Symmetry: T
Subunit: 70 residues, 12 copies
Amino acid sequence: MSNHTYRVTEVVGTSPDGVDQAVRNAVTRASQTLRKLDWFEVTQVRGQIEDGQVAHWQVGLKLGFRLEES
Amino acid sequence: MSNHTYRVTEVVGTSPDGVDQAVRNAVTRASQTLRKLDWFEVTQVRGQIEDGQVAHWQVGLKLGFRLEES
Amino acid sequence: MSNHTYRVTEVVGTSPDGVDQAVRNAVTRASQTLRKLDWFEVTQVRGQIEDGQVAHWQVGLKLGFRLEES
Amino acid sequence: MSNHTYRVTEVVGTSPDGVDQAVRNAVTRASQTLRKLDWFEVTQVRGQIEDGQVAHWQVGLKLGFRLEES
Amino acid sequence: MSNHTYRVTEVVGTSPDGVDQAVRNAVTRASQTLRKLDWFEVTQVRGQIEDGQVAHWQVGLKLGFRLEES
Amino acid sequence: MSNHTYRVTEVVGTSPDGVDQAVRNAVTRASQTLRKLDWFEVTQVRGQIEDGQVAHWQVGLKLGFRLEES
Amino acid sequence: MSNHTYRVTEVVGTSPDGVDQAVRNAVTRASQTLRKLDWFEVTQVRGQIEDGQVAHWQVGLKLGFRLEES
Amino acid sequence: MSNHTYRVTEVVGTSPDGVDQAVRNAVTRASQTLRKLDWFEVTQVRGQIEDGQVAHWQVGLKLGFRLEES
Amino acid sequence: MSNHTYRVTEVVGTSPDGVDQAVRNAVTRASQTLRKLDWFEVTQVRGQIEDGQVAHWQVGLKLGFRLEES
Amino acid sequence: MSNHTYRVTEVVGTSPDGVDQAVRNAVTRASQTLRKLDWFEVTQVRGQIEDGQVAHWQVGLKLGFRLEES
Amino acid sequence: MSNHTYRVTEVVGTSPDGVDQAVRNAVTRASQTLRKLDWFEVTQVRGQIEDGQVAHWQVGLKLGFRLEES
Amino acid sequence: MSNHTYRVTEVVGTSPDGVDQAVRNAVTRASQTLRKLDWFEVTQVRGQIEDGQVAHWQVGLKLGFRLEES
Ligand SMILES: CC(C)(COP(=O)(O)OP(=O)(O)OC[C@H]1O[C@@H](n2cnc3c(N)ncnc32)[C@H](O)[C@@H]1OP(=O)(O)O)[C@@H](O)C(=O)NCCC(=O)NCCS
Ligand SMILES: CC(C)(COP(=O)(O)OP(=O)(O)OC[C@H]1O[C@@H](n2cnc3c(N)ncnc32)[C@H](O)[C@@H]1OP(=O)(O)O)[C@@H](O)C(=O)NCCC(=O)NCCS
Ligand SMILES: CC(C)(COP(=O)(O)OP(=O)(O)OC[C@H]1O[C@@H](n2cnc3c(N)ncnc32)[C@H](O)[C@@H]1OP(=O)(O)O)[C@@H](O)C(=O)NCCC(=O)NCCS
Ligand SMILES: CC(C)(COP(=O)(O)OP(=O)(O)OC[C@H]1O[C@@H](n2cnc3c(N)ncnc32)[C@H](O)[C@@H]1OP(=O)(O)O)[C@@H](O)C(=O)NCCC(=O)NCCS
Ligand SMILES: CC(C)(COP(=O)(O)OP(=O)(O)OC[C@H]1O[C@@H](n2cnc3c(N)ncnc32)[C@H](O)[C@@H]1OP(=O)(O)O)[C@@H](O)C(=O)NCCC(=O)NCCS
Ligand SMILES: CC(C)(COP(=O)(O)OP(=O)(O)OC[C@H]1O[C@@H](n2cnc3c(N)ncnc32)[C@H](O)[C@@H]1OP(=O)(O)O)[C@@H](O)C(=O)NCCC(=O)NCCS
Ligand SMILES: CC(C)(COP(=O)(O)OP(=O)(O)OC[C@H]1O[C@@H](n2cnc3c(N)ncnc32)[C@H](O)[C@@H]1OP(=O)(O)O)[C@@H](O)C(=O)NCCC(=O)NCCS
Ligand SMILES: CC(C)(COP(=O)(O)OP(=O)(O)OC[C@H]1O[C@@H](n2cnc3c(N)ncnc32)[C@H](O)[C@@H]1OP(=O)(O)O)[C@@H](O)C(=O)NCCC(=O)NCCS
Ligand SMILES: CC(C)(COP(=O)(O)OP(=O)(O)OC[C@H]1O[C@@H](n2cnc3c(N)ncnc32)[C@H](O)[C@@H]1OP(=O)(O)O)[C@@H](O)C(=O)NCCC(=O)NCCS
Ligand SMILES: CC(C)(COP(=O)(O)OP(=O)(O)OC[C@H]1O[C@@H](n2cnc3c(N)ncnc32)[C@H](O)[C@@H]1OP(=O)(O)O)[C@@H](O)C(=O)NCCC(=O)NCCS
Ligand SMILES: CC(C)(COP(=O)(O)OP(=O)(O)OC[C@H]1O[C@@H](n2cnc3c(N)ncnc32)[C@H](O)[C@@H]1OP(=O)(O)O)[C@@H](O)C(=O)NCCC(=O)NCCS
Ligand SMILES: CC(C)(COP(=O)(O)OP(=O)(O)OC[C@H]1O[C@@H](n2cnc3c(N)ncnc32)[C@H](O)[C@@H]1OP(=O)(O)O)[C@@H](O)C(=O)NCCC(=O)NCCS
Ligand SMILES: Cc1cc2nc3c(=O)[nH]c(=O)nc-3n(C[C@H](O)[C@H](O)[C@H](O)COP(=O)(O)O)c2cc1C
Ligand SMILES: Cc1cc2nc3c(=O)[nH]c(=O)nc-3n(C[C@H](O)[C@H](O)[C@H](O)COP(=O)(O)O)c2cc1C
Ligand SMILES: [Cl-]
Ligand SMILES: [Cl-]
């Protein structure tokens, strides 16, 4: 949008219950400090296995947010 | 399968509730007009953020379907 | 970790209900024969369509597990 | 947006004057037959050379447009 | 070429005898409905195995063809 | 250069007139807050279409800048 | 298919006569020890040159086969 | 074309005014020593920043040219 | 780990003596300002040549660190 | 092999009869001017279509050859 | 080489002292159980950070080894 | 820099002692015939294994050097 610069910061979102909740936990955490959060893009789905089970879903994400002027 | 040509058309499927339902909404929509839908392949998971929440899951997909003869 | 070699074997996990359960079914199956399962990485989400519905979610995965000494 | 399916069709746009005009010529041509054109994504910049000059800029593009119901 | 838009549609071509014949079967099938077929690009070689033999070569392809005016 | 750490932050630059001006708008905006801006790398060209025209060029970019000591 | 895990093992198939025969030699060799061989995917075509001729076609392949229960 | 070998040499073209002129400067320079220049392909767009401005556009390119017989 | 968000910031580490020391110089520099540094991932190895020698090893890196609550 | 530098030059090999013969025509042509040709790697398979048939197979290739001392 | 099948198994090699020693530790470990080890290919360099230092270099690797007949 | 064309030639550098020395051996060899060598970029790390040891490190590299006028 009109001469807007967008910052695309990278995070890994995490949850013991799935891919989707891992993305929601990062979006939630990101919205506490960041404004004008517009789009995400999944970069990777990974995760920790413990006792032959998935202990944490780790979803990498790019968060696009609109830059406020300096 | 025996001299079958397959067409691989690209779509983005969408849902307010998750990645999986976004893929089901596109498969559903695709099956209304297309026949011999055989396989999908996820090309990207993206999505819109509004008010620091995920408003829509946008899952890119290739849909492989068997071409009927001309 | 200290001079540990890790083996990264590739599998496709499958489920009729979603991406997440497809990853859990492979992790479960892998843990029956393999020890020291540490991390997974999703390589692809694909799937079979039958009657314009998703019949199986097929999630490709790398499974990292720690190699026991020979 | 709310349960919208998007179709992502691929084209190469062309112009004797540059990359940007090549993208505008395809968007123009695409808008003559297609409705609800929303976003493009550049897939490749290529081009023909003739007499040691660039004769045509060929910009590959994905065009995302919203699917009307069937 | 001069302000020509090109459409790049994706297909999988198939044959029981090899990669090359799989590409020829798709080009043949594509030429029955499509005009101004100019170039192809191989996107993937895959295939079905049955009884420890290759039953079908499946060669993915992009077909570039020149768009006639609307 | 001699034991310099460089930070590579990601932005999307935007303009209604083209790819180049979209990169200049981000470089300009980045230089208002950042010092020792050294190189950029284009990660993607995308853009919004409105009324069958390109409304904004969106050029993704990595900005390499030299880190001042902490 | 219904909660089946698939193992995707990687091999390079080889032949002095071509790409296709190199894939057939690996599929043949793989079927001597492995059961439920379902699909292959070409990862790379490489090869040795000797005396300005191609001495061996080396085709990389992923072999997907269905895992029997443990 | 009929048993023609093509050589694909890689260059970075440069200009203080944009992406397009950077590609034209390389094509020009390449045509002074090379014959049968047929196609280019952009491999990357990068560039130097000086005083918070873009000092040079650096466009990577593959140049395809037809090989004359030895 | 349990609902932890991880930030994945990108840097280029530099050294006149090698790839490894270039990664150590960035990790060192990063640890002066950042806490809960957990993993790195090499994105690229590049470098400057001066007088036909390698003057600096430039190793790109993603640094994963655990986000403290806001 | 012991402190040998290898040069990896890129070519497109061409044939009206297939992928394999296209690779043989380039290897043949390359061996007329180049010595110590060791390995090739296929970078892409493309081709021209004329009258709904494949007129030329165009196989991209990297040719690795051992550098003689200067 | 003459109708040889090669198996390409994936491992992560580890060392507290660098990238190279991490590759040597995996090659060593692999040679204790595997015969006809021919080539490796680095797939990734990653690593653990502890107390703002690199605790382990983790180098991913493909190991190509020649398959003995079944 | 001001209307400079840069040539990006590809080589594999080799050493029995490591990745770094393999890059230094190629840079050294390249500087005997080439002038204005400016930057390298690692394209891959591979290597030969003999007797369960690494016999040669093979580091692929792009060498960017400034083109002198024709
Ligand atoms: C929020 C944000 C976009 C603001 O960007 P900005 O407009 O450049 O503003 P900043 O406040 O970062 O200003 C630049 C700062 O870096 C400093 N700086 C500038 N150039 C520098 C250099 N070469 N080396 C070191 N520091 C430098 C400035 O002095 C200033 O610091 P100061 O406030 O201590 O003086 C940016 O801080 C950011 O991208 N944050 C990431 C947030 C994130 O990813 N959160 C994840 C939540 S899940
Ligand atoms: C269904 C489909 C496979 C049929 O393919 P097909 O066998 O080639 O049949 P088509 O009906 O497209 O025939 C080609 C048409 O394009 C025209 N055509 C052929 N060459 C052309 C060219 N160079 N320029 C312009 N038009 C051309 C033909 O004249 C014909 O149009 P007409 O019916 O108006 O005469 C194809 O239409 C398709 O791929 N659709 C995409 C569906 C999709 O992705 N849906 C998403 C749902 S989620
Ligand atoms: C478990 C595992 C890591 C053990 O690795 P290892 O330490 O090398 O031990 P192995 O038992 O495989 O030993 C090597 C075997 O291959 C043989 N071998 C060695 N080199 C060989 C060659 N060039 N050609 C053929 N066979 C060879 C050895 O003789 C031995 O076989 P044997 O027991 O019949 O004598 C390995 O078997 C593995 O990676 N398995 C994959 C498991 C998997 O992916 N499961 C999926 C569950 S979802
Ligand atoms: C516009 C578009 C999205 C409409 O998609 P849709 O909702 O699926 O509707 P369509 O009419 O295309 O598809 C149904 C048609 O395909 C046919 N079809 C369905 N399944 C089929 C199969 N397996 N094999 C062959 N044909 C099939 C149907 O019979 C029907 O043909 P008909 O119209 O002759 O009855 C689709 O045509 C499209 O993607 N077009 C591409 C536009 C483009 O790229 N333009 C470029 C401008 S620069
Ligand atoms: C041939 C082709 C290029 C023609 O493209 P075109 O110039 O855009 O012409 P179309 O006939 O597709 O026109 C657009 C159609 O989609 C409709 N349409 C346009 N925008 C739409 C939207 N947002 N949602 C749904 N439908 C839409 C139009 O109403 C029109 O349908 P109609 O014929 O029922 O009126 C296109 O049909 C195509 O790409 N086909 C694929 C062919 C193929 O892959 N064949 C495989 C052979 S192996
Ligand atoms: C400028 C920049 C390089 C400075 O980096 P730096 O040397 O690490 O300095 P910072 O000021 O970021 O210091 C780290 C801060 O994060 C905090 N921090 C450190 N580790 C942390 C963790 N694990 N969790 C949460 N916060 C943490 C520190 O407490 C400090 O915050 P404070 O200022 O409230 O004390 C950095 O701010 C940056 O990369 N900014 C992005 C600029 C940008 O992209 N601008 C876009 C312009 S278009
Ligand atoms: C066939 C195959 C799928 C069977 O997988 P599986 O169900 O996991 O069963 P396996 O017997 O291989 O794995 C268990 C073995 O690994 C061992 N193992 C388990 N975890 C381990 C670890 N962390 N470290 C070392 N060894 C381990 C077990 O002790 C057992 O060894 P044993 O048989 O000596 O008791 C698997 O062997 C495989 O992937 N083979 C590759 C086949 C191939 O690539 N063929 C090429 C032909 S061209
Ligand atoms: C133009 C070109 C295709 C000619 O290719 P060719 O038909 O192989 O002809 P060449 O003249 O290169 O012949 C091979 C040369 O390398 C030598 N050579 C062959 N094998 C060799 C080896 N293994 N080690 C070292 N030298 C070798 C030959 O002896 C001969 O050199 P000579 O002329 O000193 O005897 C080639 O020079 C080229 O690709 N140049 C790049 C042009 C370029 O990128 N320009 C940039 C403009 S912006
Ligand atoms: C440390 C870090 C994770 C903290 O993230 P955080 O929890 O989001 O907290 P921050 O303080 O950075 O972000 C909020 C700031 O950005 C601002 N901000 C939020 N949304 C914004 C927007 N849309 N536009 C501009 N600024 C915005 C806030 O106003 C606040 O600025 P303030 O501190 O001046 O009030 C983050 O600063 C970071 O990623 N730093 C990079 C460190 C790095 O790369 N170091 C390299 C060492 S080698
Ligand atoms: C064969 C080859 C490896 C020889 O490499 P080499 O050892 O560097 O030897 P060269 O003869 O190229 O020596 C460098 C030449 O470039 C010149 N040169 C060096 N640096 C330069 C610069 N920065 N700008 C312009 N020219 C430069 C030298 O002056 C010399 O030219 P000259 O012989 O006119 O004096 C090289 O010519 C090559 O890679 N050719 C490609 C072959 C090919 O792809 N063939 C296709 C067959 S299908
Ligand atoms: C060594 C190796 C190449 C031998 O391959 P091979 O020639 O296929 O021989 P295998 O011994 O694996 O034979 C296949 C086994 O899997 C079984 N099998 C075959 N198809 C199967 C299927 N669909 N499901 C489950 N098991 C199957 C066979 O019954 C046989 O098991 P058995 O020994 O209990 O009878 C193979 O074991 C391998 O790739 N190992 C990995 C070694 C490795 O990565 N080591 C790391 C060192 S760092
Ligand atoms: C050094 C270099 C940049 C010079 O580039 P240049 O300015 O184009 O100069 P060249 O000398 O290559 O001139 C082009 C040559 O190819 C010939 N040529 C031009 N077009 C041609 C075509 N289509 N087919 C065949 N030959 C052609 C010219 O006739 C001339 O050869 P000649 O000297 O025998 O007359 C180029 O030789 C090069 O890139 N070399 C690679 C060096 C390298 O990789 N070294 C490795 C060191 S580790
Ligand atoms: C691998 C390959 C890629 C090509 N890519 C393009 C391209 O992107 N744009 C284009 O106009 N022509 C392309 N061509 C066609 C050539 O530009 C050229 O017109 C054709 O090879 C005939 O040239 P010749 O007469 O020199 O053989 C390509 C050809 C080959 C073999
Ligand atoms: C980077 C690299 C890649 C290679 N790839 C292959 C390959 O794909 N197939 C092959 O048979 N040999 C390959 N080789 C081995 C070479 O073909 C050759 O036999 C070896 O370098 C010895 O050659 P020399 O005696 O000319 O040094 C490769 C070597 C290197 C350094
Ligand atoms: Cl025609
Ligand atoms: Cl400055």
